[PDB]
Design a protein around this ligand. Structure first.
Ligand code: GTP
Ligand code: GTP
Ligand code: GDP
Ligand code: GDP
Ligand code: MG
Lengths: 431, 426, 99, 426, 431
């Protein structure tokens, strides 16, 4: 009955998506041809008369070199070929080109396949979109993707899983230019929106998973485990079951603030799993470490508004509420005085499943915390400084302006970003 | 004869009902298929209080299971004793309440309130004469408490002179597991004070204290917590279906408990609870068990009567027991501990005795005591509701759903009226 | 009254014996290929009835009572074997002179 | 009928009472499981003084185990008679005192006194008519003397009209095995002089001196020391549980032994102690009991009545015996050694005869003697408390926990006045 | 549930935690894989659900040459990977390098690891540490080690096992400068503090154990027996029990006097075990001899301030209290006038365990004595003679000042230690 639609936008969306959909098939025991050798698969797969399953995913891309690798590999028989949407020409790291020039040629094809998938749904819990701030139409076409979804669909959930531009490492020069102009869309047309930046995931894989040389496949296996633990309360029985709309309402203090931080615990190797036990209290303390956080910001600087936790495995409610008491006793961590009861707890019996060839090991007890802090103002004023530092001498403006957008729209992104950072300042003051 | 229709609200109501009908079907000797396999004729002599006649020597419960997410509903039907319920009573919505009172009271509950009122009126007409109802729910979520407050308020006006029993699980400070949890409780208790006959105050936090210190549970899952709440529900209304020396049904236990119509929130406790090791050293006699009913460790609420005044007490005993002891021990408590007990009401304690014991036991007793110490649990909820509402926490999830902002202010003012009213009786 | 107590004890012993049969069946089915991973199962069956770290009481039916009274923690008491020799009370009485 | 609730404090207390609770269990014929395996009817007639009724015809001792360390709480479980105690009475904590009096009395032991006071009230208010309590503790330890004096000082206000027996284990000059042993002892006698009815002075040096010179044992373990303490403790409360020709309860021994309420320190002793080689060369006879009874070798304290005066003397007998040989022997020792007994009390001694002897034996005797010669005990402790305190020894281990330095001044001044009160009665 | 976290620091620390943790494994019958072929192991080992006993030790070093032998040798699979901490460059025989410049880089990394062990502890008796005065990390980082556990864990126990310079032989030249500058740290930030110098352990093996050429392994076993018998009453049942809280109280009369002298008896070879009888009397007289004393100072010049006794094996309180009487009658042993009864006695049941390669013999009874004396000022005044002799011409002063510490701390730590020798002498004067 319950079901969602995945919208993998961009080259990062495809590499994330095939990491997620590889994990889903082995989780539900479905072969690459789609036929198995119970309604757990109903949330993402669609049943036909012949015994197959079609994933409810739409791949949004503007370059054919990233779709044809999907159509050639092992999963060529899995996905329906009309779900993979390829543009004729890439915007090539341009928000403006994917907003006014390139994106309106295939905006009709995306909304048509959205209509077909939502027609098959008997009741639609929400949408998941996957994209990155850095790229052109991963940030650009996503901006006009939300405009059509919000107007057509009123109160349907639309989750925005994003990748923030890292403060130090980058693969572009116009990367801060693309990120700030997407603040207009996400502030207005997003029910929820996560972010993890790549520099933080770089620190964890070096020291926790014991990998000298990882690529984006080992990062996207980690991000697949985050989404799997989120949606498994929809797919499997739980001692406490938490739906998609449940923790959506319970983490946001204001409609202007819908930006949690995601962390996962434990992340250890199969040789280090031979040594250390993994209990409920041991994995609870690991989510509060600023080293193991998956965003380069320190909650020790800021203040927690609310907390959402997602437990999986041999998890007893006795040990959950015992470890919460220990965390409130330590004075290194703080909570705002206007949220005394800030936690939310969910438990599922099924342990997380592992992928063959992956880096992690199979674990009984795991937790995926969703905490909203005032430490996100640390990673915004840094990017607002660098967006102001480049734009002081008026650089790269001729490429964006000449494509159709006026020069005053850059100044519009200044005040909306300046006002949004002011709304996070008034949260942290105590009454 | 005197019949009770059972109502369950939400996921917490459905899990509570699953064990409650599991423990009393074995009490009446009912197989998983629903037939009768009995040993004594007294088991079938009163079965129409909670069951219905069916063709072929079968009996079905008179219960309706109401929630909004069908995921937990299939756990009830595919459970151990879920094949006995009639399928028309499973009344379910299509989307959740969002842990929101207003979604269950204004937005989505207004459509499901018509379905439950159609079913419950077709079942309340079947009996001889309607004694009353029951309601099992929790105040932590919006499914059980959102429309649960709305379904009571519509059926109270339709049935003006009846008995209305509600099982409330009010939020706890230590084992709080919801951010919007005081918003659910404080604005919903306004419906439990003006349109409800009786209410029991359960705390999950007190349930772990009993299961960890006393009952010796290494892993106390919600099944064993649900065992205690159902055993408390069984012991209160065992006089409905079983004869005794001195009996007291639900109506006679109620009118002697409530001195004023707006004071109907009690604290339960149960007494003969022991572990695997301490079973042998304990002797099951009357003065042994009356130590543990009044013991502050075995309360089913997170309030301490030593800080307050016992206003009216009940005790429903069970088993073949001598009436002299049931009376000399209870007057012994009243005279020795003369500081807590009120002075303006002498002979505070109500008394009931039943003959047949629970299986595996020879003697049992149930404690129900109303005091002024319940205002500990009410002021603690009130300050956490006032703290969030000063900066308007989560206001957009309730204002835009069909209700204004002044409904919280009258919720706080009426909540202030109740806690100040408890002081002047102290 | 004495007959009732004996009946209750016999019923509890029968239930524990049924569990022991089921657990032995599961361990024997699982240990067909290798015995490298049967150790948590052996620990689970050798845990003992109740939270008991001390020796079982054979005359009592194998009961293991617990001792958890430590503020809010309630930590169970540990168990240590003694190198000190076991003594008989009759021999201690004769040796100390109360014979 | 007249009942005594036993108390146990410390590692010394947990090992004194562990041997003590199995010699009554042999005395009344009780198996380690708990049931009754007896031969006569007189054993089961008066058994409710120390035992409590359970289900299935089983009996549990009415004692509580108190300690601040879980280390020796294991050894009382895995002992010969560890399964016979109910687990709810095993009171223990997490942080010990570490051979300090200050930790037990104010800082660490004040959180355990409120836990055990709840326990002792449940096992006292359930009884018909208490005679009183009994304590075992040591002044050479932390939890025995630190918080053990806090149990003494608190239950006096709760139950003023009762009795309180204690077997104090005061330190020894030669068998001193604690550096701060006088600080524990000196600050606790001031608590014993005010809030204690009867006091027995147990010295382990006296226990070794008996075991070598009289009993001829090469390996005197603490089992042989705890059995000697239990044999005196069993034979001093005999006549409550066993009828006699001239019976005497512990209250009758109290009223005849303390002519002034601060003069309540005694000397215990036991009648037949004899090696295996010397067993066949003596005959159990009434003069043979009282000949060895006043012998200074068999005193259970480290002080000799030749240096002082027998202020008041007891005699408690066990076994089938006559009245003239009890009376003619003891008037003989009153007359012949007339220089030791005081002059201002004639007929200094109370006598008592009980019928049932201890098992394996047919005659016995017990001694309680209040004297001025026990001030030899107090002067040696107080000369060494001032010896350490003149150089401010170990003062940071006591001052920083909350208690000021003036408590040292009053504790040695009060103990100096008590010795000066003893002297003017000599 | 009580337990002790061993904190070894230095190349001395790694080599002494190599022999101490070899003794603990065979004492509780634990294979080098960490799995056994009772709860006595709970003080030093941790229980994974799979059944592996992971030690709760923190090896600290600033050079990788001695840590990497642990990861290669027999016990590679026993020790947990994150518990062995290694810096980049060593302080190289320097207080100043290990304190203000080099040692401040891993002070965050080590004390993150004690959090993972202390939060696992439901009840902690206290921390044990091991350090050497001669080294750089043993002198520099160890002085920042005691300063921040004092802040983080207020009233916890911090026992010390220190290595002091020998009176004549030495393995360094600026070793006296390292020794004095840590006197202030082990004064205000140490609870109890034993010291052992190697020359007084060199002289034992040549005449008692009959070893012609001992090396540091033949010494590291002997200090391992001392730490065993101190904590043996925590682990094992006894007729009388003593704890780390107890012997702190009955040995330390003043907070400025917390420096015992640690002995052991008997230490005899397998050929002298066949011949000489070992009763309780014949082992309690060996702790009073000056030849068996383990510090290069003689109590015959000083005053026995307090005494602590630890007994192991088939020991009876009859023989303990008989031989305690005899040693008190003799006049070569003196007590102060204000400690008339200065003894503390502890008794355990299991005899100490013999290890493969240990040159001692399997023995029934043993004793370990901690007798605080005034004669510990004998060894201190000899070194302060050599510190001021070395500081007379201001040699080696350029090495310390430029690192970050000032030259005013040179006169401070000598004047701090000057008044401590006066306090230790005024106690011995009778009234
Ligand atoms: N976390 C994460 N980020 C990725 C991954 N792949 C790409 N990115 C981000 O994507 C940004 C660049 O966008 P692209 O990978 O080119 O894809 P795009 O967003 O559609 O941009 P275009 O190719 O120009 O259409 C970089 O700044 C990266 O930060 C990935 O696998 N994981
Ligand atoms: N008692 C004793 N001392 C040792 C032993 N091994 C090394 N030492 C001491 O170690 C000191 C030398 O410093 P190291 O421990 O080797 O190295 P460090 O402490 O890490 O300091 P750096 O060399 O600067 O890194 C010498 O003064 C020795 O006294 C040993 O086995 N027993
Ligand atoms: N006593 C009891 N409380 C429960 C149980 N399950 C959940 N709860 C409590 O109920 C609250 C959430 O209830 P919820 O599932 O949202 O109820 P619903 O809104 O009616 O579906 C939490 O605070 C839990 O502590 C149960 O089985 N027994
Ligand atoms: N008579 C007697 N003395 C004991 C016993 N156990 C210990 N002691 C003495 O008590 C002292 C140690 O007692 P301790 O353990 O500190 O007592 P606690 O602090 O109250 O637990 C030693 O000097 C022993 O001689 C016992 O069972 N009987
Ligand atoms: Mg693109």
């Amino acid at each position: 009955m319950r079901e969602c639609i995945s919208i993998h936008v961009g080259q990062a969306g495809v590499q994330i998506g095939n990491a997620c959909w590889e994990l889903y098939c082995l989780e539900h025991g479905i072969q690459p041809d789609g036929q198995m050798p119970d309604d757990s698969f109903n949330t993402f797969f669609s049943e036909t008369g012949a015994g197959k399953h079609v994933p409810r995913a739409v791949f949004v891309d503007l370059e054919p070199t990233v779709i044809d690798e999907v159509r050639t590999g092992t999963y060529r028989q899995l996905f329906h070929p009309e779900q993979l949407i390829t543009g004729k020409e890439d915007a090539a790291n341009n928000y403006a080109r994917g907003h006014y020039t390139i994106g309106k040629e295939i905006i009709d094809l995306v909304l048509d396949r959205i209509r077909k998938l939502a027609d098959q749904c008997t009741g639609l819990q929400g949408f998941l979109v996957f994209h990155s701030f850095g790229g052109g139409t991963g940030s650009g076409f996503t901006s006009l993707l939300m405009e059509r979804l919000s107007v057509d669909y009123g109160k349907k959930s639309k989750l925005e899983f994003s990748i923030y531009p890292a403060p130090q490492v980058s693969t572009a020069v116009v990367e801060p230019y693309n990120s700030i102009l997407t603040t207009h869309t996400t502030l207005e047309h997003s029910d929820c929106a996560f972010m993890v930046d790549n520099e933080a995931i770089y620190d964890i894989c070096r020291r926790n998973l014991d990998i000298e040389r990882p690529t984006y496949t080992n990062l996207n296996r980690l991000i697949g485990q985050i989404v799997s633990s989120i949606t498994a309360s929809l797919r499997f029985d739980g001692a406490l079951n938490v739906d998609l709309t449940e923790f959506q309402t319970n983490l946001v203090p204001y409609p202007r603030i819908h930006f949690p931080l995601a962390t996962y615990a434990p992340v250890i190797s199969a040789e280090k799993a031979y040594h250390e036990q993994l209990s409920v209290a041991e994995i609870t303390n690991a989510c509060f470490e600023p080293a193991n956080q998956m965003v380069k910001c320190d909650p020790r600087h800021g203040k927690y508004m609310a907390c959402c936790l997602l437990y999986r495995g041999d998890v007893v409610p006795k040990d959950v509420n015992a470890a919460i008491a220990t965390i409130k006793t330590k004075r290194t961590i703080q909570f705002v005085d206007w949220c005394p009861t800030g936690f939310k707890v969910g438990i599922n019996y099924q342990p997380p499943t592992v992928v063959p060839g992956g880096d992690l090991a199979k674990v009984q007890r795991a937790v995926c915390m969703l905490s909203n802090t005032t430490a996100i103002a640390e990673a915004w004023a840094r990017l607002d400084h660098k967006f102001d530092l480049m734009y002081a001498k008026r650089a790269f403006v001729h490429w964006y302006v000449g494509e159709g957008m006026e020069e005053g729209e850059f100044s519009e992104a200044r005040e909306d970003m300046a006002a949004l950072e002011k709304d996070y300042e008034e949260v942290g003051v105590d009454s | 004869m005197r019949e009770i229709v059972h109502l369950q609200a939400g996921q917490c109501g459905n899990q509570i009902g699953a064990k409650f009908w599991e423990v009393i079907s074995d009490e009446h000797g009912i197989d998983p298929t629903g037939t009768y396999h009995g040993d004594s004729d007294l088991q079938l002599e009163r079965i129409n209080v909670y069951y219905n006649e069916a063709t072929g020597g079968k009996y079905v419960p008179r219960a309706v299971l109401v929630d909004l997410e069908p995921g937990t509903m299939d756990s009830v039907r595919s459970g151990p004793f879920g094949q006995i319920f009639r399928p028309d009573n499973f009344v379910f919505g299509q989307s959740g309440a969002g842990n929101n009172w207003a979604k269950g009271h204004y937005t989505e509950g207004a459509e499901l309130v018509d379905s439950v009122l159609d079913v419950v009126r077709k079942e309340a007409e079947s009996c001889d004469c309607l004694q009353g109802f029951q309601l099992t729910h929790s105040l932590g979520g919006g499914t059980g408490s959102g429309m649960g407050t709305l379904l009571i308020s519509k059926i109270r006006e339709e049935y003006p002179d009846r008995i209305m029993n509600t099982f409330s699980v009010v939020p706890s400070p230590k084992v709080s597991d919801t951010v919007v949890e005081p918003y659910n409780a404080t604005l919903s208790v306004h419906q439990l004070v003006e349109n409800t006959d009786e209410t029991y105050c359960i705390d999950n936090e007190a349930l772990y204290d009993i299961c960890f210190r006393t009952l010796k549970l290494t892993t106390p899952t919600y099944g064993d917590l649900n065992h205690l709440v159902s055993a408390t529900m069984s012991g209160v209304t065992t006089c409905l279906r079983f004869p005794g020396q001195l009996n007291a049904d639900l109506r006679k236990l109620a009118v002697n408990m409530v001195p004023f119509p707006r004071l109907h929130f009690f604290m339960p406790g149960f007494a003969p609870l022991t572990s695997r090791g301490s079973q042998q050293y304990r002797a099951l006699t009357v003065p042994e068990l009356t130590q543990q009913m009044f013991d502050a460790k075995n309360m089913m609420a997170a309030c301490d009567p030593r800080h307050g005044r016992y206003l009216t007490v009940a005790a429903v005993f069970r088993g073949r027991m001598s009436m002299k002891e049931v009376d000399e021990q209870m007057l012994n408590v009243q005279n020795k501990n003369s500081s807590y007990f009120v002075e303006w009401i002498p002979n505070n304690v109500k008394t009931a005795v039943c003959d047949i014991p629970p299986r595996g036991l020879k003697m049992s007793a149930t404690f129900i005591g109303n005091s002024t110490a319940i205002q500990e649990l009410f002021k603690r909820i009130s300050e956490q509701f006032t703290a969030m509402f000063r900066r308007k926490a989560f206001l957009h999830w309730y204002t835009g759903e069909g209700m204004d902002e002044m409904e919280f202010t009258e919720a706080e003012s009426n909540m202030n009226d109740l806690v100040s009213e408890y002081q002047q009786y102290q | 009254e004495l007959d009732y107590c004996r009946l209750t004890e016999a019923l509890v012993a029968e239930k524990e014996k049924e569990f022991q049969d089921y657990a032995r069946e599961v361990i024997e089915l699982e240990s067909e290929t290798t015995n490298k991973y049967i150790y948590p199962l052996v620990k689970a069956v050798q845990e003992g009835p109740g939270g008991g770290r001390g020796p079982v009481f054979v005359d009592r039916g194998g009961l293991r009572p617990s001792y958890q009274a430590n503020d809010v923690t309630g930590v169970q008491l540990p168990f240590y074997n003694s190198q000190g020799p076991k003594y008989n009370f009759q021999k201690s009485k004769r040796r100390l002179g109360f014979t």
